[PDB]
Amino acid sequence: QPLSVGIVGGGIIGVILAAGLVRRGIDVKVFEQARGFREIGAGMAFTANAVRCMEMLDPAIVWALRSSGADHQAEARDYLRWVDGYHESSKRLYQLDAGIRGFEACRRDQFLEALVKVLPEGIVECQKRLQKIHEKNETEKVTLEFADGTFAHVDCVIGADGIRSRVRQHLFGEDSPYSHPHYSHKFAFQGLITMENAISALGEDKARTLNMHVGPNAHLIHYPVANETMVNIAAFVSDPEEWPDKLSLVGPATREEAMGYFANWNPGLRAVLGFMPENIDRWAMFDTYDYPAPFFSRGKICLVGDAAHAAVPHHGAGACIGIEDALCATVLLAEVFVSTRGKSSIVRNRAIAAAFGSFNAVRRVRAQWFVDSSRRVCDLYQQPEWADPQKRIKAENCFEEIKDRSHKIWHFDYNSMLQEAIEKYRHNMGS
Amino acid sequence: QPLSVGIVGGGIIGVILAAGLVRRGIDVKVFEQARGFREIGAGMAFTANAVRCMEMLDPAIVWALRSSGAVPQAEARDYLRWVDGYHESSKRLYQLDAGIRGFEACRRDQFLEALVKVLPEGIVECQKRLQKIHEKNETEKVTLEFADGTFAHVDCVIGADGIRSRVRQHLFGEDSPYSHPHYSHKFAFQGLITMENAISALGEDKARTLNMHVGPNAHLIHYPVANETMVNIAAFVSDPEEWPDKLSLVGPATREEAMGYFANWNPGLRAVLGFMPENIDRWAMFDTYDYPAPFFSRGKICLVGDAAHAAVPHHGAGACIGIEDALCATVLLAEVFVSTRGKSSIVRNRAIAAAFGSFNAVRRVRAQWFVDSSRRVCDLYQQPEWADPQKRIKAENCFEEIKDRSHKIWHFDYNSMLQEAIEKYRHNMGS
Numbered sequence A: 001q002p003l004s005v006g007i008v009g010g011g012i013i014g015v016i017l018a019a020g021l022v023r024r025g026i027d028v029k030v031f032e033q034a035r036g037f038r039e040i041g042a043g044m045a046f047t048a049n050a051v052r053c054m055e056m057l058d059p060a061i062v063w064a065l066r067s068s069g070a071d072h073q074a075e076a077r078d079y080l081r082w083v084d085g086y087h088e089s090s091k092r093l094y095q096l097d098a099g100i101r102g103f104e105a106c107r108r109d110q111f112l113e114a115l116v117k118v119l120p121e122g123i124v125e126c127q128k129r130l131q132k133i134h135e136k137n138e139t140e141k142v143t144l145e146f147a148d149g150t151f152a153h154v155d156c157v158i159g160a161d162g163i164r165s166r167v168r169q170h171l172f173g174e175d176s177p178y179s180h181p182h183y184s185h186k187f188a189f190q191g192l193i194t195m196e197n198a199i200s201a202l203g204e205d206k207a208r209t210l211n212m213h214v215g216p217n218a219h220l221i222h223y224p225v226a227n228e229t230m231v232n233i234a235a236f237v238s239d240p241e242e243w244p245d246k247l248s249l250v251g252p253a254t255r256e257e258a259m260g261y262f263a264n265w266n267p268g269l270r271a272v273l274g275f276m277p278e279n280i281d282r283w284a285m286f287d288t289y290d291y292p293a294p295f296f297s298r299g300k301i302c303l304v305g306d307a308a309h310a311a312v313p314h315h316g317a318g319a320c321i322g323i324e325d326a327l328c329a330t331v332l333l334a335e336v337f338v339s340t341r342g343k344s345s346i347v348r349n350r351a352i353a354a355a356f357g358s359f360n361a362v363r364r365v366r367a368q369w370f371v372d373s374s375r376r377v378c379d380l381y382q383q384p385e386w387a388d389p390q391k392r393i394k395a396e397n398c399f400e401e402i403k404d405r406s407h408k409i410w411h412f413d414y415n416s417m418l419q420e421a422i423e424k425y426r427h428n429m430g431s
Numbered sequence B: 001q002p003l004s005v006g007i008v009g010g011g012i013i014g015v016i017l018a019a020g021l022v023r024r025g026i027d028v029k030v031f032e033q034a035r036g037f038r039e040i041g042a043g044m045a046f047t048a049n050a051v052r053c054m055e056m057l058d059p060a061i062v063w064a065l066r067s068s069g070a071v072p073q074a075e076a077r078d079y080l081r082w083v084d085g086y087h088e089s090s091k092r093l094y095q096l097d098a099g100i101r102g103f104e105a106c107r108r109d110q111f112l113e114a115l116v117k118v119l120p121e122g123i124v125e126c127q128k129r130l131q132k133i134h135e136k137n138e139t140e141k142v143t144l145e146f147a148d149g150t151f152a153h154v155d156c157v158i159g160a161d162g163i164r165s166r167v168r169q170h171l172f173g174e175d176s177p178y179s180h181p182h183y184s185h186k187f188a189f190q191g192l193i194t195m196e197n198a199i200s201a202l203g204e205d206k207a208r209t210l211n212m213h214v215g216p217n218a219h220l221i222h223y224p225v226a227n228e229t230m231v232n233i234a235a236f237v238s239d240p241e242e243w244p245d246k247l248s249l250v251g252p253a254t255r256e257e258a259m260g261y262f263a264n265w266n267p268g269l270r271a272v273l274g275f276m277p278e279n280i281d282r283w284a285m286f287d288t289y290d291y292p293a294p295f296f297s298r299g300k301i302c303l304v305g306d307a308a309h310a311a312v313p314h315h316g317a318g319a320c321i322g323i324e325d326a327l328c329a330t331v332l333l334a335e336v337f338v339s340t341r342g343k344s345s346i347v348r349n350r351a352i353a354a355a356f357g358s359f360n361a362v363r364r365v366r367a368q369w370f371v372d373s374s375r376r377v378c379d380l381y382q383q384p385e386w387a388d389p390q391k392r393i394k395a396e397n398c399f400e401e402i403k404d405r406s407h408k409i410w411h412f413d414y415n416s417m418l419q420e421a422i423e424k425y426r427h428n429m430g431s
């Protein structure tokens, strides 16, 4: 009597989770609203920790990540670097070693395509936009109603459907602010420049490495791309007014609008913004900071990834946090599956809820700390004090807070998470 | 071009290894001398620690195992029990709690079958009995010559070919005694009886549990099989004689032969043997104890499983040791593959040699410890002093050591082993 999971959302997280459930023999379907791939071209990076979590899910996920990424002498180490972006000094401020393969990078859309090829045929159903969830009794199945009029029936449901998750709206009600993300009152300009232009502006050292330029109420990050032939610029600025409601979270923008937010900043940084194309993009930064979930699960329904805890991206690890969710959910459902072989329907369904109950108990604190921490480190990158020449030593003490908060993300003990998860599941079963 | 690995031997360790390596993108071939009747219908059991290693090699390995056993209101803990076999007292002497699914049991032939279905097509080559190995410069492929006159060319070679390993003889020499196992001067009778007989003879509590009966110079172990409808008997006895040269290691025997080794034992136990069939098998027990490998590896050849370290089966975990081998070799070769990806053929082949070097450094002590330990616990099960009631405190005092040695096996820290093996690989490359 096999265990059927309906995953709503075929993004990175829903697909990584599907891979882990299917390699363990659980019947999975992924319902994806789109009709093919998306996020076509962007870089993403995973901590060495998240990569090990991927490997426990199915080692093939890690082959997929490396298939989708990028001479003699030694092996390179991975460094976060911060640079002073306001003053003319533009002095190197801090640096953090993450180690050999401390981060592993890939093209999102090509990683996700590699992932889908790892799953059996028939796992992913496209053009299934979940509209309504119907919950009957715990011993009965959960019905998913899609916008095309088809239904589907599954023993349990997982929301992997992103920052605007419909599973979240079902749990907390389509009219709750808890069901929607909200503006962080910051937005970002993104564009590319040639590697030649980046060296003029910054020097060769700075142009061929990831650097965050800090400053008052704004900050700018760049790193090389396309075999070091170009450099990506992402520049983050403060917005006082509400993000217009019903207004799209992307939209075109102009090089010169970017430049106006950095006019008082040092000259290498301004030359970089000027080297961008005339037309570039503006991305609002939303998250679940203001109305975080009261619970990641209830009954036979569970939230994972951005659906549970969308973050602003100032740690560059939001998916990693979702990869832990997917490990923890995959391990619990295998324990449900082995530990209820041959028991009655009543027993199998209370196991499912008991496990989801443990998932929430185990994940919600780290996940919702990470959402807070993302806003926090962004604050520290944009302190007004960076501009005060009397306060650039109070301001330069944030780097210990960044190291500790970084390390707390990178050195997650996922094995103790899995051990505590199994204990809480047994506990929750009167065992 | 991917790293290629020729595994000699399609037993449980060689096929587990292959699964772990292909799931990571390494191009594998398994060469098995046998036609494809494969394993015996006997049963084996795996510690929860070995099962976690299985998961990390490939989660479908554990699925192959749980689907290759039977199906078991609260959850059953796994206990090992020792009883006095030599007096009619039949007193329960000791008990080790191994926890929920502390062991996971299967049928060997059903597992190896499931495992091979997991593998991609085109991996296991049957009727390929290795005869010679031709090594050349580190930078060249290794040539495997088979008895059908055919050849194969692999970047590196693993010996998964068992207690009579041919890869072992190439390393140490056909006429070296390090190339061969040797007799442990004990052998086992094996056969089945009904649960009805077993209850009638031992009583229901013992008949339906695993118990070991200790006594002088022999011991007996029984456990339910075939979904508690029968009981398997394994009776071990001592043999002062040598085992005849090239006499086969299995042989037919009689319930009456086995009964005479236990004539002085307690009644219920002699009744168990009387209930066996009239014809039963006699299993000689050889190991690598007298002449243990001086090294598991050399150049681009590496031994694993029973080839490296076969043992007498008195911890019932010798294939667990092999799965650790398999995980360590798999994690190392995966590290060779990512870290030498776009480098010269010299670096890649040196990296293999450095990985096989690390394997030997981190595995040999624990596995040669285990071989010795297997003989040692048998000597404690078979103390002459079990016979003398005045020496009872001394005899029973043995179980602390059994506890220590069992916990050393079951609590293996495979995460530190792997980190140790990665550090040693990097040190061996010159870093």
Ligand SMILES: Cc1cc2nc3c(=O)[nH]c(=O)nc-3n(C[C@H](O)[C@H](O)[C@H](O)COP(=O)(O)OP(=O)(O)OC[C@H]3O[C@@H](n4cnc5c(N)ncnc54)[C@H](O)[C@@H]3O)c2cc1C
Residues within 6 Å of the ligand: A008, A009, A010, A011, A012, A013, A014, A031, A032, A033, A034, A043, A044, A045, A046, A128, A129, A130, A131, A160, A161, A162, A163, A164, A165, A166, A304, A305, A306, A307, A313, A316, A317, A318, A319, A320, A321, A322
């Ligand atoms: C600029 C930026 C840079 C980032 N860089 C990194 C990084 O380097 N490393 C890292 O770890 N994280 C990074 N993150 C965070 C990371 O991208 C996200 O955490 C990750 O995409 C979340 O995965 P997901 O599957 O939960 O959500 P999504 O990617 O949003 O997938 C949700 C899926 O569900 C579908 N869907 C939505 N609604 C429905 C519905 N009703 N019915 C059916 N399907 C539905 C959607 O089409 C989509 O396929 C970054 C984020 C941003 C914004």
Ligand SMILES: Cc1cc2nc3c(=O)[nH]c(=O)nc-3n(C[C@H](O)[C@H](O)[C@H](O)COP(=O)(O)OP(=O)(O)OC[C@H]3O[C@@H](n4cnc5c(N)ncnc54)[C@H](O)[C@@H]3O)c2cc1C
Residues within 6 Å of the ligand: B008, B009, B010, B011, B012, B013, B014, B031, B032, B033, B034, B043, B044, B045, B046, B128, B129, B130, B131, B160, B161, B162, B163, B164, B165, B166, B304, B305, B306, B307, B313, B316, B317, B318, B319, B320, B321, B322
């Ligand atoms: C009675 C008994 C009970 C046991 N119970 C347990 C248990 O409960 N739990 C546990 O973990 N372990 C147990 N063990 C130990 C376990 O069975 C062994 O450790 C394990 O079988 C070794 O696996 P392997 O793949 O290295 O060797 P093998 O299983 O011996 O496979 C070796 C393969 O290589 C093939 N081969 C040999 N030579 C060549 C050649 N030249 N060319 C090509 N192929 C070749 C062979 O035909 C064979 O298929 C038990 C052992 C015994 C005797």
Ligand SMILES: [Cl-]
Residues within 6 Å of the ligand: A311, A312, A313, A314, A315, A316, A317, A318, A319
């Ligand atoms: Cl992020």
Ligand SMILES: [Cl-]
Residues within 6 Å of the ligand: B311, B312, B313, B314, B315, B316, B317, B318, B319
């Ligand atoms: Cl054994």
